[PDB]
Every structure is written in C-alpha cells, then in structure tokens.
Amino acid sequence: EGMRRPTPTVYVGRVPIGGAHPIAVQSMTNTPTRDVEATTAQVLELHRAGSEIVRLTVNDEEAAKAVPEIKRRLLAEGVEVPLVGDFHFNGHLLLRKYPKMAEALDKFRINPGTLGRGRHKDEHFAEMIRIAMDLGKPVRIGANWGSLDPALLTELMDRNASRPEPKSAHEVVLEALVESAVRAYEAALEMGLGEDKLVLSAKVSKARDLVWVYRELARRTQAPLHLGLTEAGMGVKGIVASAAALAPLLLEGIGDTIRVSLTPSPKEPRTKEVEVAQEILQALGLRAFAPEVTSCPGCGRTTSTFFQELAEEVSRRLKERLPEWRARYPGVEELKVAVMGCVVNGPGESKHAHIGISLPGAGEEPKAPVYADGKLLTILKGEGIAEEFLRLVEDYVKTRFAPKA
Amino acid sequence: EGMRRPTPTVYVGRVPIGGAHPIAVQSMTNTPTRDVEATTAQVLELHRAGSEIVRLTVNDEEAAKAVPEIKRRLLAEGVEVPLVGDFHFNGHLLLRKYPKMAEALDKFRINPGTLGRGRHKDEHFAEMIRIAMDLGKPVRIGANWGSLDPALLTELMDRNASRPEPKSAHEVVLEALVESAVRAYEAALEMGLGEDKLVLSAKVSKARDLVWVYRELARRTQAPLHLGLTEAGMGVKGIVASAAALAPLLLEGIGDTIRVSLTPSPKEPRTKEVEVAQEILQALGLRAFAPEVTSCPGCGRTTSTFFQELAEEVSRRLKERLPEWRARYPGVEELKVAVMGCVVNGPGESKHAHIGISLPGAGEEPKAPVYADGKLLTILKGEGIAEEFLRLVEDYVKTRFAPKA
Numbered sequence: 173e174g175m176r177r178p179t180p181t182v183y184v185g186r187v188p189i190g191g192a193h194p195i196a197v198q199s200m201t202n203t204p205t206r207d208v209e210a211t212t213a214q215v216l217e218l219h220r221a222g223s224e225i226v227r228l229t230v231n232d233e234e235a236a237k238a239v240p241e242i243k244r245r246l247l248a249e250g251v252e253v254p255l256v257g258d259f260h261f262n263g264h265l266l267l268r269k270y271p272k273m274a275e276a277l278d279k280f281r282i283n284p285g286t287l288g289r290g291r292h293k294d295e296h297f298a299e300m301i302r303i304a305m306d307l308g309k310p311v312r313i314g315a316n317w318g319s320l321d322p323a324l325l326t327e328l329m330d331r332n333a334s335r336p337e338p339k340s341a342h343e344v345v346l347e348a349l350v351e352s353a354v355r356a357y358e359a360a361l362e363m364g365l366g367e368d369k370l371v372l373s374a375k376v377s378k379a380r381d382l383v384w385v386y387r388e389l390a391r392r393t394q395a396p397l398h399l400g401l402t403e404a405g406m407g408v409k410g411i412v413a414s415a416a417a418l419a420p421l422l423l424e425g426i427g428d429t430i431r432v433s434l435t436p437s438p439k440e441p442r443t444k445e446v447e448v449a450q451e452i453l454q455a456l457g458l459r460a461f462a463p464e465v466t467s468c469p470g471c472g473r474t475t476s477t478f479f480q481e482l483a484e485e486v487s488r489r490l491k492e493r494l495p496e497w498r499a500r501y502p503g504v505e506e507l508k509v510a511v512m513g514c515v516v517n518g519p520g521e522s523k524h525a526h527i528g529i530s531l532p533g534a535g536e537e538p539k540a541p542v543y544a545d546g547k548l549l550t551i552l553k554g555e556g557i558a559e560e561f562l563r564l565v566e567d568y569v570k571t572r573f574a575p576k577a
Numbered sequence: 578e579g580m581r582r583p584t585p586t587v588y589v590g591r592v593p594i595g596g597a598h599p600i601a602v603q604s605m606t607n608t609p610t611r612d613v614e615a616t617t618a619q620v621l622e623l624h625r626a627g628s629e630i631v632r633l634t635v636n637d638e639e640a641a642k643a644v645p646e647i648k649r650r651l652l653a654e655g656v657e658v659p660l661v662g663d664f665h666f667n668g669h670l671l672l673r674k675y676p677k678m679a680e681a682l683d684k685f686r687i688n689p690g691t692l693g694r695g696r697h698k699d700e701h702f703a704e705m706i707r708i709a710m711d712l713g714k715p716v717r718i719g720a721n722w723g724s725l726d727p728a729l730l731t732e733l734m735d736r737n738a739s740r741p742e743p744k745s746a747h748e749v750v751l752e753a754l755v756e757s758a759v760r761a762y763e764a765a766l767e768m769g770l771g772e773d774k775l776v777l778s779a780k781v782s783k784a785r786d787l788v789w790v791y792r793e794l795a796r797r798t799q800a801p802l803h804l805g806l807t808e809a810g811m812g813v814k815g816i817v818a819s820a821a822a823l824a825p826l827l828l829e830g831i832g833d834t835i836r837v838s839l840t841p842s843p844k845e846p847r848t849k850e851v852e853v854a855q856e857i858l859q860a861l862g863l864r865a866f867a868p869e870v871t872s873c874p875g876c877g878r879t880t881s882t883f884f885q886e887l888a889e890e891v892s893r894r895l896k897e898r899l900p901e902w903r904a905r906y907p908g909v910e911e912l913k914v915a916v917m918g919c920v921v922n923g924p925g926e927s928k929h930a931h932i933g934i935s936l937p938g939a940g941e942e943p944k945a946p947v948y949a950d951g952k953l954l955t956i957l958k959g960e961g962i963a964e965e966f967l968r969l970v971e972d973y974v975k976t977r978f979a980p981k982a
C-alpha cells in the first residue's frame with residue numbers, strides 16, 4: 173500500500189501470514205479454557221466480529237483436555253477459524269501429555285521468557301519445537317518484557333557495561349527483549365523448523381519502546397511479525413495507545429498480523445479489541461472490512477443535535493445493511509461515506525468520499541448537496557433528509573459495487 | 578524527548594507554541610457563537626477538561642458581537658484561556674467592522690481556500706493579516722482539503738500533466754494543499770507578519786495522506802505546526818484514526834499543537850475530543866496530564882469479572898483523587914499503576930510501573946503480590962485485596978510525590 177517488508181509465508185490454519193498477504197486480525201479469549209461451552213461461544217463470537225485467528229490459553233491439564241472438544245465444536249459448525257495455543261512454564265509438559273490437543277491446535281505460541289530456568293530450559297524449548305515439527309504446526313516465538321528471560325538481560329547488562337559508551341539500562345532491557353526473540357528464532361531454525369512455520373513477536377507496553385523494538389526485529393530477522401502493544405489498558409487510553417503504537421510501524425511496512433490487548437470494561441464485550449484492530453488497519457488503508465463514515469466534528473456553523481443525529485444514523489444504517497451488502501455487492505467493504513455540517517468543507521470533503529452529504533450551515537441557502545464519485549448527484553431539501561440520503565447510498569452501492577464480468 | 582523540530586515560539590495568549598515548548602492541546606466549541614450563555618459555558622467546560630487553547634467560529638455579525646462578551650465573562654472567572662477565531666468567507670468584513678472582537682480574540686484563523694475566489698482573495702487575505710499585525714495578534718494559516726483552493730488545484734494539475742511522469746490526481750491534491758499553506762505562509766511573512774505570529778496547518782481526513790503532508794510542510798517551512806486529522810468521524814473509528822494519523826508524525830518530532838476532530842455522539846460531551854488529544858500525547862511520552870493504568874487484557878488464566886472490575890476501580894479512583902493529588906503532590910501526573918491478571922507477566926510489568934499488583938490466577942491463592950519502585954513491596958491476601966491495594970496506591974503517592982525543597 174505500502175510498502176510491505178518482505179517475509180516468507182506462514183499458514184496459520186488456512187490463513188496465510190506474511191508480506192504477500194493481508195495483515196491478519198487476531199485476538200484472544202478470556203473464558204476459562206476448561207469451559208468448553210463458554211470458550212466455544214466466545215471463539216465463535218470473536219470469529220464473527222472479524223477475528224481471522226483466535227488465541228486461547230492452554231494453561232493446565234484441564235485446559236488441554238478441552239481443546240480437542242472446542243476444536244470439534246467449531247468444526248461441527250463449519251467454523252474453520254485457526255486456534256493458537258498460549259503456553260507458559262509447562263508448554264512442553266502439556267503438548268507431550270496431550271497429543272490430541274497438540275493436533276487440535278493450528279499453531280503453538282512459545283514465550284522464550286517462560287520456558288524454565290537453566291539447562292532444562294533448552295530441553296523444554298527443544299521438546300516443543302520437536303512436537304511442532306512432527307505435526308507440521310507453525311510456532312510463534314513471542315517475547316514480552318513482563319516476562320523477560322533473566323539470563324539474557326544479565327548477559328546484555330554484562331555486554332553493555334563494557335562498551336566504550338554504555339547505553340541506558342532502559343535501552344538494554346529492550347535490547348535483551350529483541351535478543352530473546354531473535355536467539356530463540358535462530359535456535360528453532362537451527363533445529364530445522366521451516367521459515368514457513370515461524371512467527372515472531374516482542375512486546376512492550378509503551379508505544380515509543382515498541383517502535384524501537386519492532387524496528388530492530390525487522391532489521392535482524394526475515395520472519396513474519398506479530399505486532400501488538402501489550403497491556404494497553406482500559407477505555408480511550410487503551411484504544412489510543414494501541415493505535416499510536418502500531419501506526420508508525422505499519423506505515424513503515426512492519427507487521428504481518430496484529431492483536432489489540434485491551435482491558436475490557438465489565439460492561440464491554442471481548443469483541444471490542446477486534447473492533448480496534450480493524451479500525452487501525454482500515455484507517456491506515458491496509459485493510460478494508462466495512463463501510464466507513466467521514467464526518468466533521470460539527471461547530472457553531474451547523475445545528476448540533478440535527479447533525480450528530482444524522483451522522484449517527486448513517487453509521488448505524490451502514491452497519492445494519494452490511495450483512496446484506498457483503499453477499500449482494502462484492503467490494504462494498506471499501507465504501508467511504510461523508511456526512512458534513514456546512515459548506516466550508518462539506519462539499520470538498522464529500523467529493524473525497526464515494527458518496528457524501530453536506531447540510532446547509534448558518535448563512536446558507538436551505539439546501540443539502542449530495543455528491544457521488546466526485547460530482548453533484550442531487551440536492552436535498554426539507555424533512556426526512558436522513559432517509560433520503562440513505563436511499564441514495566443504497567442505490568449507489570447497488571450500482572458501483574454490483575457483480576460484473 | 579525526542580527530538581522536537583525546531584520552530585520559533587508563537588504565543589497564543591500566555592500559551593507558547595513551538596519546538597521549545599510542550600505540545601499544546603486545543604479544541605473547538607460547537608455551540609452557536611451568538612449564544613453567549615451556551616458558548617461561555619462550553620469554553621469553560623473544555624478548558625476544565627484540559628484544553629489549553631479554545632477555538633470558536635466567528636461566522637457572522639451576531640457571532641462577532643458575542644466574542645467580546647464571552648471573553649469578558651471568562652476573565653471575570655479568572656479563566657485566561659486563549660480564544661481562537663475561525664473565519665471563513667467574511668473574515669475581513671467581520672474583523673474590520675468589529676474591532677473589539679478583533680481585540681478580544683487571542684488569535685485569528687485564516688483558511689486560504691475560503692478567502693474569496695481570485696484577486697480580491699488577496700485583498701481579503703491582506704486585510705486580515707494587516708489587522709492582525711496592528712494588534713500584534715498571532716494567526717494560523719490553516720489549509721484543509723475540504724476547502725482546497727480550486728485555481729491552485731487546476732494549476733498544479735496542469736503543471737503535473739507536463740512532468741515526464743505525472744503523479745496521480747490524488748497525490749497532486751496533497752501537493753496543492755501543501756502549496757496553499759506554504760504560499761500563504763510566505764505571503765504573510767513578506768507582508769511583515771512575524772515568525773513569532775504565524776502557525777500553519779494543512780489537514781486531510783486520511784492518516785497516510787496526513788503523514789505525507791505534514792512531512793512536506795515541516796520540510797518546506799519553519800513555522801510551528803498545528804497537527805490534526807480533520808473530519809475523523811465517530812466512535813472508535815474517529816479515535817483510532819486520529820491516533821494513527823498523529824503518532825507517526827509526533828514520533829518524528831513534527832507537531833506543536835493538536836486538535837482532535839471527533840464527531841460527538843448525541844449522548845457524549847464535546848470534551849471527549851480533549852480526552853483523546855490528551856491520551857495521544859501521554860501515550861507517546863510527550864506530555865503527562867494524569868496518572869494512568871497499565872493493565873493486561875486478562876485471559877483464561879485469571880477470573881474475568883474480578884480482574885476487569887478491579888482494574889476499573891483502580892482507574893476510577895485515580896481519576897477521583899487527581900484533583901486532590903494535583904495540589905498536594907507535584908509531578909503525580911507521571912504516576913503509572915499496573916493491574917495484572919496473573920503471574921506470567923504480572924510481576925515483570927508491575928516492576929516497570931510506579932506501583933503494581935499481580936493477581937492470583939486460575940492456579941489459585943487469594944493473595945496478590947504488590948510491587949513498588951521496581952521491587953516487591955508486600956503481599957495482600959484474603960478478601961478486600963482490592964481496597965488494600967488502593968490504600969497502598971494512595972500511600973505510595975503520599976511518599977513518592979511528597980513536597981520537596
């Protein structure tokens with residue numbers, strides 16, 4: 173778009189991850205995995221909302237035993253969404269003990285910071301890779317600075333201490349995180365895990381750090397990169413931090429799949445993080461999921477209640493019509509609609525949309541121009557402007573995005 | 578931090594804008610400017626929420642007649658927030674006819690696309706600039722692709738047609754927008770408007786485009802830059818788009834004041850855009866407005882309702898106590914609190930905060946280790962871990978951010 177950083181293709185189930193493929197949205201469940209009903213339902217829900225890949229924790233024996241049945245229930249519904257198993261501390265134990273789960277999973281996640289501490293640490297690593305290789309499973313090697321390999325930090329602390337100009341302890345923590353991921357990645361390649369089976373990540377919780385980190389990742393490896401700002405937080409803060417962190421990197425062509433790590437409000441659904449990941453990619457023109465509305469903030473030049481109501485109804489109708497438009501009209505995901513408050517930027521901004529309307533603001537003739545494909549399509553006056561506009565959009569979508577050839 | 582693109586300082590009222598100064602948050606009212614009662618109220622509201630400068634439309638005579646009164650009322654409350662006047666089409670008439678309005682304002686906004694169409698557009702431009710200079714008022718020359726100079730687009734469209742390889746119609750639009758701001762900028766300086774009286778913007782409604790644009794503006798001029806994604810839209814979309822548009826630029830050191838162009842929902846207050854502007858800068862470490870919470874998404878390894886509720890309670894308490902902490906504890910705005918769901922990343926991430934808590938996972942003990950200043954502080958057990966942690970948080974602040982000198 174672009175342009176994309178070159179990487180081999182990693183297939184997570186039927187979903188290809190890589191530089192020649194769309195950046196894939198994924199998310200993670202928060203149901204107890206031992207609860208097959210709750211976990212199956214949420215996987216469905218996340219998949220429904222647009223999660224192309226879904227991760228779940230496989231944290232103990234009960235969780236592992238449920239994974240085949242969850243996978244069974246998804247398949248019985250024709251739901252071929254890929255499951256990634258999240259493993260910490262005991263990943264080698266469960267995968268060994270439970271081969272039906274290892275087989276059920278479509279990808280394993282390994283954290284090089286939660287393997288175990290020492291010389292059995294390598295064995296756990298090697299066991300997990302071996303099982304992936306025997307089954308032909310892809311692996312994510314994912315570092316996270318909340319669980320940084322202490323031995324590596326020490327080693328780089330030692331290294332940095334004797335540089336002619338030592339770097340800051342903070343910069344060294346980052347170095348050590350990158351180094352954890354890269355060295356684990358290179359160890360897996362040395363064991364013979366194919367380039368087409370290995371995804372990397374190395375997450376931190378501050379936007380400025382994360383850009384540093386993934387720039388080094390991209391520089392030092394060829395692997396597709398899983399990008400996210402971990403422990404993003406709640407509400408507006410969590411949404412903003414996630415977007416601000418990922419955007420500079422994505423605009424640089426770094427990132428091949430993303431997850432947004434929002435803390436849900438108790439009154440919020442787990443599908444919200446999917447919404448955010450989608451809006452990030454679409455805002456950067458890197459994906460198109462669903463029609464969008466470009467609207468002005470409204471100011472003293474337009475009637476506030478009228479305007480905000482019109483903008484809200486247009487966005488709700490688009491969302492309403494989307495399930496039908498997907499089936500009927502292929503390509504409708506790229507639809508861009510404008511709703512503007514007055515003649516200052518109304519017409520101009522409307523012409524940058526597929527279709528748009530500007531209301532007459534203060535000082536203006538009581539008319540509301542509608543533009544389509546850059547030129548005046550018609551002029552609305554009177555009551556029922558919202559529904560009139562939405563009829564124009566409906567016909568527009570039918571015409572521009574109709575199936576052809 | 579950084580580093581900041583160097584610029585002269587432009588004082589908007591008492592608010593300094595420039596490379597040597599904190600990036601200033603601003604906003605814009607949407608009340609009828611002629612409604613003194615409504616508009617004074619909203620300016621206070623926005624200033625209270627943290628808008629350091631507030632813009633209001635001055636679109637007509639009635640609007641103009643109100644601005645001196647609005648300013649009077651703000652000042653009688655000891656509120657010295659700078660007011661920016663947004664002018665289109667008739668700025669020269671209003672500024673000429675209503676000199677007290679000209680004086681009451683703290684800054685004038687000019688749009689080079691809404692001046693008039695041709696050579697009287699220069700006369701309108703010059704009158705406004707001349708008035709600004711006589712009063713020593715700062716000016717923003719703000720271009721917007723929703724009101725792009727049509728003669729300018731034609732010219733560059735024609736010029737581009739004769740390049741050995743013409744650019745797309747889209748890229749030229751961006752070209753013309755830069756050139757509109759750049760040309761108006763050099764025109765105003767040639768008129769003798771001071772470098773310390775000139776701020777620039779050139780806004781588009783698409784992130785990737787906005788990055789290209791402000792990179793060009795930054796390169797071709799020396800002026801402080803007002804940065805924003807115009808017509809950002811509603812809800813999560815508008816929030817994400819604003820964040821993703823501004824972050825790449827701010828991280829590059831481009832941008833000296835920001836505005837977030839959110840379309841409010843009818844049930845949301847005009848202050849949300851200020852909230853978002855705040856979160857953008859604090860996420861990138863550029864400002865510190867208020868304590869923040871770093872929290873995990875939660876997963877199958879912890880109990881959802883408890884974790885999400887506790888995280889919420891922490892964030893609400895921070896918000897509740899800040900007015901008190903603001904007076905008592907200088908610097909508390911930098912406070913970072915972590916709330917984590919389990920032992921995998923809990924301790925690590927917590928040790929990266931000022932104070933944080935690691936909760937007991939689905940592998941259980943109702944007890945939660947608390948970290949402060951990078952090390953283990955204590956271990957809470959039993960019921961009321963939530964309330965006990967928050968008492969620890971209050972005590973932490975009382976000690977860490979205690980009065981000094």
Ligand SMILES: C/C(=C\COP(=O)(O)OP(=O)(O)O)CO
Nearest residue numbers: 314315316375401402403431433
């Ligand atoms: C579950 C977990 C961390 C946060 O979920 P995250 O998607 O923020 O990070 P990671 O899993 O490291 O990619 C364990 O590292």
Ligand SMILES: C/C(=C\COP(=O)(O)OP(=O)(O)O)CO
Nearest residue numbers: 719720721778780807808836838
């Ligand atoms: C009111 C207005 C535009 C939108 O408010 P904006 O702050 O999004 O854009 P601008 O004012 O052009 O910097 C007039 O261009």
Ligand code: SF4
Nearest residue numbers: 468471474513514516
């Ligand atoms: S389009 Fe008009 S009403 Fe909307 S923000 Fe711009 S000037 Fe104000």
Ligand code: SF4
Nearest residue numbers: 873875876879918919
């Ligand atoms: S800290 Fe624990 S509960 Fe939270 S997301 Fe990470 S692994 Fe899951």
